[PDB]
RNA sequence: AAAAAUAACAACAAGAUCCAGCAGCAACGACACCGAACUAC
């Protein structure tokens, strides 16, 4: 059928994920476009055929420093056009955005800074959010349905995090971040893909390095597939397999009934 | 409206309890639900409609950036 | 009018006993009979008419949800 | 001004003894002789010109509709 | 338009004393030497330029 | 659009007449009209004061002035 | 139609002059002008408060400009 | 956990339901409240203990003409108060409405006339709908949420009907009925129960008497658990079992997280 | 007062109509634009001044074969523009569509295949139907207020034909045809003037060749005035003179409030 | 230059094939090209017109035509 | 050249009320007061200069024949 | 560039200082008087010296008629 | 002049590569470039449409082609 | 011959470094300061070096009054 | 005149560019070559954009000549 | 008097007649108005 599968997997360094076997798992896991983010490597590094998969193209945009950030993207067929710019110092200087265009459908690999590294990172995250909300408000005029593979590092509602009573103070769950994420899914009209098909809790996509939280399943949902209201109806299913995890985040696999094309 | 619209939008999205001082001295309290060119909506147990031409000042209860 | 009329017409259709606080601190009570772009009408025994330039606020007695 | 004009015209033709309450608080009494953009000529023994921008409300006194 | 301008013209041509009650509650006396769409001149003892918005009502001193 | 406010203000300025501005609130300010506009008027005092048009009720010159 | 308002307000805001905005109701506000618009202005005496133009009467600068 | 199971069904005559064995199956299925639309019997007829189940109370409103209509309702605990009325002439005459109040929740056994008999029936149905729109616009103010377990006899979207191209002129699917349903479920905000728990097709509740349609699965969805937006979040599961057919329609069990109490 | 008139006379061969004196009947019938369908002759044949009514213009587009198709159009005044063809092989190669634009209005003459001759005819009818609904969907957003006063050879509702149950298998009332017509009408917002001015039954235009069928009034309504919902407000009345019955079709005449002009 | 435009338009005029000229604004004119010239083309249809070259975008011959 | 100048001269001498449609799709009206190799003065209660590089077409309200 | 109509018309509009209105290809309407014009530029006066290009102008209508040489 | 336009257009023509042209109005035509001169291009599509150079904006090939 | 009035105006706008607008035919509102203008291009100097074509410009509105030499 | 050195520099350093046509749409990419009327823009696909249809050419990063 | 810019609509016969109901507001903006200019709610 006209199924379209998209996989968003944050690796926190493509080297570790490739060592754990993310390359082979992706090559085996059938999909159309892999929104893998947080490469932490320059374009000359991704160009290495070791990372390049068979039957999947490669695109990448890195910051001035390879480890400072960067985001990559795979695709089954050659997209109509790829663009590695957003227009913000917090986005271009860090290489946190890359968009690929198919017939009236654009997939973007968004990457927000974690913020837990320090206060400066939190300020940069707030600035990036305040600029991205404006970018979205400006993009509401276009007719193309957008599929942002976002690693927002922000939990929306209570179900998106366990033991919220204790997480109300830790970064990634404060009041302004929650308000921004609700405005994105609220007034602007956008809607999350995962929360559309499965309105149940415990579906987390991130856990600290300590295995205690993993055993207790104390995690957040720092991965979203933001869809224009036009694509909200085409959301068939979503899944967050935790066992085949190659980093702190878990692969988020969303399948639609939409059929992309060159 | 280069400052009115963004300011009101920031006060709305964050749900900041604002205090609107009218012209006749009395002040109303509540968060901005929605606003227009000539009407603002205050939610404070009763969704009331205040008029722009009657408001004097709008002070946020907590600081807000721009 | 993007948010003014959708509220006044809703109050009219729903017949909510609204209280209008003018700019000079005086309060009026009643239902909106037929609001216009300049003047609103009340549904009291006298059917008073209040201009929309001397009205400060319009608070309904029961919470009205925008359609 | 879809209903303002016909309402004022009906109050004028019938010579209704309206009561115009201004914004400052003082009230004026007298039938409406004529009206126009930002002006109402209230004539009842003595003629007066009340500006609409200063009028707050107009109680028709008698139950009169359009 | 059809009332304000002709009424002010009649008040001026007749030189009738005109009491202009402001929205603040003050009673200004004098004749309308001239009038504009935003300001009205009330000269009798000292020159004055009363703004239109600040005028609540304008009553003549005798029939017009 | 007006043709009587601009010349009156220009005269009150160039003749440098001690002007008294009474606002709708019910107060008094004194000084000379240094500059005018469609929505503001600068008044000279110990500190130049920008008075808005919509708030001004009357502008009385301390001495009678003739129109141009 | 603001050849006199906009430059004055811009100078007062850039120079960071503690101005006092006397409203129409008789209240005396204070604080520095942060950013002004065609229908609203912003002050920061203690917090970023928006004052509506139609409610302002005069703007007395604490220092001659 | 607090599982409140509501079982709505159209008996199309309590006699046929009792003959086919609706009572036993209904008693077997654990449920807090059961709505029986179209009883076609007087209140005195329902007085027979044959219809009275153990652990359930007997409530019913009979039409002026017993054969023309009638509704029933059983609950596990004595409701706060029964409101066997609506206000309109059609409802009061045909007893097509009966309500039971609970803690911040009230269940209504709505029944719109099918309109499949003739033209007068279609006109009565149009009048009933043009009056129920006003009724719902009035009830939109009160705080307590409502659960209308009603056989609206009107399909909403294509997902509710197969071969919609053929039924474009059959009563219960014309343009005005579709518009009224879309307005009641969109403009007013009364979100449906099925379209929020399972956004899949083929979920039919009605089947013509012809066995051909039954074998071919040609069916329409007429039953509806209309929920106030306040209760939408309290939906969990809703599946239509067709194998226990006891009338022209089939039950519509729906489980909610809300828990009722006197 | 302001009034316009339009006539639709599917001559089914201008030769047969002229043989029955239809030219004089049309000349006597005062009208602004006459849209006769099925000329069954080339443009050179229509150039004969016999068919040219004094005071009325002559336009015509002939199919690749005379008897195959062909359409004509008469206007009391010189139209601003006259066009033919729609890009489809079922229309251009047969000239089954001829449009004329005056000002603020555009009147078109359309001739759909009867589909009653053979299976290939019905297949071409389905092709023309789908291509034409596609084109019309592409024309909805345009400014021109189109009036496709044309013969569709398809009955929409039961009101357009008695004993519809027997006509279920006969062409013109087939399920897919009725569904296509209902989609062209409602889904896209188009309506018909004749039904709008009067929702009365027993009014038909087409009749079989059998005499007893016409005696007992067994006819279909195949000629329609597909009219954009914008100008529907200016429709006055519509008639169906069943007295002549000169040809298989009837002279569907409709008067509107709007007035055309060069 | 302009070595192909001449024969194409010449043949379209000789055969009098109904052509549809789509302009730059998106509007479409329909009719027979009566006379082609530099910087201007003459149309033929009820109420003929004179279309300018710099405003034309495409010329669809509608029916097959060879060069 | 061969077709533009004679056509325009005929339209001007005969004083035919033509309608000039611009490149944006706007419709103009008036009689051809004068023409040039770059602009056209069209009169209709006011002499407007329309640039030839902004004229989509010219529709003569009266049939005209070439010389 | 060889025209015999635009030059005198524009020179008359400039010397006479007639209120002119320029409608551009985009459909925007500018209003003012001409200061100086060339084969590719026109300087309009209306609180600013506005250099409007020629190719971007669609029509030029004066507020009142003018005589030609 | 046109040192780079022809080597590309004639190349697309010879290989008959399906290309999509984008008119200045904003829409998109599709097809193979049949013939082209210094003023117009021809699309080999069924309609055999002709497009004007000045009205064209871009020519996106369906597949990458080598520059001669 | 083709820039008798455009060349000095643009040169003055560039020298004075006055905020220019440079409206495009589409109706967009550009801005910056003309750094160097040639026959068919204008290099606007703003936050980032920009290049705008001549045939796509429709208006050059300087924010401050300028006098031609 | 300046267009030639400008495009030569944008092509030498291989700077990501953004072209903006008359209709108003934006085309990101990287200049491959430029002639008197045509410019080759390569971004997954190689397309030929016309000079007369281009309105602006913004380099993604600051560049002079 | 001008969307710091729609990765692009197989194309606009054409824009100058009553809440099955809140463990309840130290109290309703202090009630529907109670006719020569004086600068903190």
Residue numbers in the entry:
A (entry chain H), H (entry chain I), I (entry chain G): -2 to 259
B (entry chain F), D (entry chain x): 5 to 70
C (entry chain w), K (entry chain J): 5 to 71
E (entry chain C): 5 to 68
F (entry chain D), M (entry chain R): 4 to 71
G (entry chain E): 4 to 68
J (entry chain T): 4 to 70
L (entry chain L), N (entry chain N): 3 to 71
How is this structure described in the published paper?
The widely occurring bacterial RNA chaperone Hfq is a key factor in the post‐transcriptional control of hundreds of genes in Pseudomonas aeruginosa. Here, we describe cryo‐EM structures of higher order assemblies formed by Hfq and its partner protein Crc on control regions of different P. aeruginosa target mRNAs. Our results show that these assemblies have mRNA‐specific quaternary architectures resulting from the combination of multivalent protein–protein interfaces and recognition of patterns in the RNA sequence. The structural polymorphism of these ribonucleoprotein assemblies enables selective translational repression of many different target mRNAs.
